[PDB]
Design an enzyme around this catalytic site. Sequence first.
Site, mmCIF file in Angstrom:
data_model
loop_
_atom_site.group_PDB
_atom_site.id
_atom_site.type_symbol
_atom_site.label_atom_id
_atom_site.label_comp_id
_atom_site.label_asym_id
_atom_site.label_seq_id
_atom_site.Cartn_x
_atom_site.Cartn_y
_atom_site.Cartn_z
ATOM 1 N N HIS A 85 0.865 -1.182 0.000
ATOM 2 C CA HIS A 85 0.000 0.000 0.000
ATOM 3 C C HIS A 85 0.899 1.228 0.000
ATOM 4 O O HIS A 85 2.128 1.115 -0.044
ATOM 5 C CB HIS A 85 -1.102 -0.027 1.067
ATOM 6 C CG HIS A 85 -0.642 0.117 2.481
ATOM 7 N ND1 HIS A 85 -0.212 -0.957 3.234
ATOM 8 C CD2 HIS A 85 -0.635 1.184 3.312
ATOM 9 C CE1 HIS A 85 0.074 -0.549 4.455
ATOM 10 N NE2 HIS A 85 -0.170 0.743 4.520
ATOM 11 N N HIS A 87 1.554 3.780 2.101
ATOM 12 C CA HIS A 87 2.146 4.428 3.259
ATOM 13 C C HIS A 87 3.668 4.238 3.320
ATOM 14 O O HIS A 87 4.243 3.358 2.676
ATOM 15 C CB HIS A 87 1.495 3.925 4.544
ATOM 16 C CG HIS A 87 0.078 4.374 4.723
ATOM 17 N ND1 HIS A 87 -0.794 3.747 5.574
ATOM 18 C CD2 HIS A 87 -0.617 5.399 4.186
ATOM 19 C CE1 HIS A 87 -1.966 4.346 5.558
ATOM 20 N NE2 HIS A 87 -1.885 5.359 4.720
ATOM 21 N N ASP A 89 5.696 3.049 5.498
ATOM 22 C CA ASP A 89 6.213 1.741 5.910
ATOM 23 C C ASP A 89 6.190 0.712 4.787
ATOM 24 O O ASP A 89 6.672 -0.410 4.987
ATOM 25 C CB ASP A 89 5.536 1.227 7.197
ATOM 26 C CG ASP A 89 4.036 1.012 7.053
ATOM 27 O OD1 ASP A 89 3.366 1.841 6.410
ATOM 28 O OD2 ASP A 89 3.506 0.068 7.682
ATOM 29 N N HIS A 150 -7.239 -1.803 5.916
ATOM 30 C CA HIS A 150 -6.350 -0.802 6.493
ATOM 31 C C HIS A 150 -6.223 0.416 5.579
ATOM 32 O O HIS A 150 -6.117 1.555 6.054
ATOM 33 C CB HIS A 150 -4.986 -1.447 6.760
ATOM 34 C CG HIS A 150 -3.924 -0.457 7.054
ATOM 35 N ND1 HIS A 150 -3.770 0.126 8.295
ATOM 36 C CD2 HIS A 150 -3.015 0.117 6.245
ATOM 37 C CE1 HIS A 150 -2.798 1.009 8.236
ATOM 38 N NE2 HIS A 150 -2.320 1.002 7.014
ATOM 39 N N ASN A 181 -3.049 2.017 13.014
ATOM 40 C CA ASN A 181 -3.255 3.352 12.477
ATOM 41 C C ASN A 181 -4.381 3.285 11.453
ATOM 42 O O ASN A 181 -4.192 2.785 10.340
ATOM 43 C CB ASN A 181 -1.982 3.902 11.863
ATOM 44 C CG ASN A 181 -2.048 5.383 11.718
ATOM 45 O OD1 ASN A 181 -3.117 5.939 11.456
ATOM 46 N ND2 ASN A 181 -0.917 6.040 11.895
#
Length: 232
Positions: A85, A87, A89, A150, A181
């Site tokens: 994804h 993000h 991280d 998420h 998150n």
Amino acid sequence: SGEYPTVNEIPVGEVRLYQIADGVWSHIATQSFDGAVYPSNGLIVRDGDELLLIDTAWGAKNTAALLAEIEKQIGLPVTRAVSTHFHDDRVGGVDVLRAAGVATYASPSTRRLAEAEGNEIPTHSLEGLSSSGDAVRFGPVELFYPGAAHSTDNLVVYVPSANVLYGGCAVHELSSTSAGNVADADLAEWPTSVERIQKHYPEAEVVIPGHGLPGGLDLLQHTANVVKAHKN
Ligand SMILES: C[C@@H](c1cccc2c(-c3ccc4c(c3)CC(=O)N4)c(C(=O)O)[nH]c12)N1C[C@]2(C[C@@H](CN)C2)OC1=O
Ligand SMILES: [Zn+2]
Ligand SMILES: [Zn+2]
């Protein structure tokens, strides 16, 4: 010394690998975000005499350290990477990978979101994943889009040779009391997306979350439970 490495056991900037199965490793690194320290996972899958990388190690310096740890511990070249994804991280470190000769990939949805957010942008688009339930092959893995969870773009990764399911951040570890998150999540759709994962990969033997300890199939039901309770 053989246990799955944990947040207080990895200084920010160092990376550790963990053997999951023959030709499958996770990578673990730590990073600070908004004044707290978190671990995060990725995956490494042997692809003949090359390696496929799933996700960066959350930051440029962490991802350089990841490449160095792979060379030390495995000694085969990382030729391709997939980010699951948009993000940091998952894509933070894509620029490092790209300058080390790694071809970087993500879905068009992930690439658009990363670009709009100011995160690093994988080079190549992965088509054939835009509808929930879609699956495509990519070297030694299958990529699967389960639906929004998420994040709206989150992908999961299955290693058929080892029945390893890498859930990424759509899957939480068993000790998790929280949905993580949720800034970009869809809590209403998340259980439905998990149900799709459970239906598609019923023979998974290891399930790896985006953060925390691997386990078995129970991580999927646990994730649905924690998300539903968070929403409640
Ligand atoms: C980088 C990642 C991120 C940064 C920092 C932490 C996380 C966590 C997390 C995991 C387990 C856990 C908690 C958080 C607390 C807790 O107690 N257990 C997760 C995850 O759940 O995947 N992702 C994290 N971003 C940042 C953000 C984009 C948006 C910008 N407006 C905010 O959205 C995320 O996902
Ligand atoms: Zn995320
Ligand atoms: Zn995450």
